[model samples]
Target: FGFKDIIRAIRRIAVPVVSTLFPPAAPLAHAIGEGVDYLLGDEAQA
Candidate 1:
């Protein structure tokens, strides 16, 4: 019911919510780059 309680509540909610929304920033950037490359036909056929 004070600063510590507020911090704990924030961490508990933020950690899971942020992790769920974004598993990792590096992969997200890679995925977006790959998607752009695919759209522009910069990727080779498999």
Candidate 2:
């Protein structure tokens, strides 16, 4: 419940925005979001 949560929150809004632009783009946008999530790395001990 840290940075990832906020990142997801943004995606919640952006997903619809992307869909509004192009329904086809929504899937790609989701992929980009997943990649970003991976780039965020796993949780840290500290």
Query: Top lDDT: which candidate number?
Result: 1
Candidate 2, residue 13: the lDDT equals: 82
TM-score of each: 0.33, 0.36
lDDT of 1 by residue, 1-46 (tens): 6999999999888876766777693577776979788787885776
Model 1, residue 37: C-alpha shift (Å): 0.7
Task: Please report the candidate that would top TM-score against the real structure.
Answer: 2
Scored against the true structure, residue 40 in model 2 reaches a CA lDDT of 81
Reference-based TM-score, model 2: 0.36
lDDT per residue for candidate 2 within 3-46, as digits (tens), equals: 99998988898887867877687677676877667678645335
- Candidates in order have lDDT scores of 0.77, 0.76
Candidate 1 similarity to native, TM-score:
0.33
> How many residue pairs of model 1 clash at the backbone?
0
Task: List candidate 1 stretches off by more than 4 Å.
Answer: 1-23, 43-46
Residue 3 lDDT, candidate 2, scale 0-100 = 90
